Nucleic acid binder design. Structure first.
Ligand SMILES: [K+]
Ligand SMILES: [K+]
Ligand SMILES: [Mg+2]
Ligand SMILES: [Mg+2]
Length: 135
RNA sequence: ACAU
DNA sequence: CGATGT
């Protein structure tokens, strides 16, 4: 029903899918950019959405923040819940970097705890997520 | 179908 | 129009 304004919103941006992937996290209320990942040469939209949520979890935990995270990605929200990114992207030399980051994000989830609620941003009711790249 |  | 996902 109501946006929880005291939250962190994340989104992926890409050039191609698969293609160059980046992501960022913003303060939902103000749009202040809180983190931005350097572009990764080849990845998928869903791998980027997953990495963005996990990075948000790590960012909030490090800062002792209980804020929830918004993502618009049904897929990535489930992958985080499962602690398993079920990506179809081939593993080869050009995808090694993204797969290393995904593997490491899963490993972090399997070795840390968090209470952070991971919430679906209701794009149909609220418009684009505040972290959107607008592309 | 839904979410990107 | 194409692709990534449940
Ligand atoms: K966009
Ligand atoms: K589809
Ligand atoms: Mg998104
Ligand atoms: Mg977006």
């Amino acid at each position: 029903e109501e946006i929880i304004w005291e939250s962190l919103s994340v989104d992926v941006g890409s050039q191609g899918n698969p293609g160059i992937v980046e992501y960022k996290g913003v303060d939902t209320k103000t749009g202040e950019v809180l983190f931005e990942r350097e572009p990764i040469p080849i990845g998928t939209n869903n791998m980027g959405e997953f990495l963005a949520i996990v990075h948000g979890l790590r960012y909030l935990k490090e800062r002792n923040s209980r804020k929830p995270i918004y993502s618009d990605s049904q897929t990535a929200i489930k992958w985080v819940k499962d602690k398993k990114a079920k990506s179809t992207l081939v593993r080869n030399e050009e995808t090694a970097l993204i797969w290393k980051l995904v593997d490491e994000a899963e490993e972090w989830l399997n070795t840390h705890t968090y209470e952070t609620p991971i919430l679906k941003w209701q794009t149909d009711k609220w418009g684009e997520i505040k972290a959107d790249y607008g592309r």
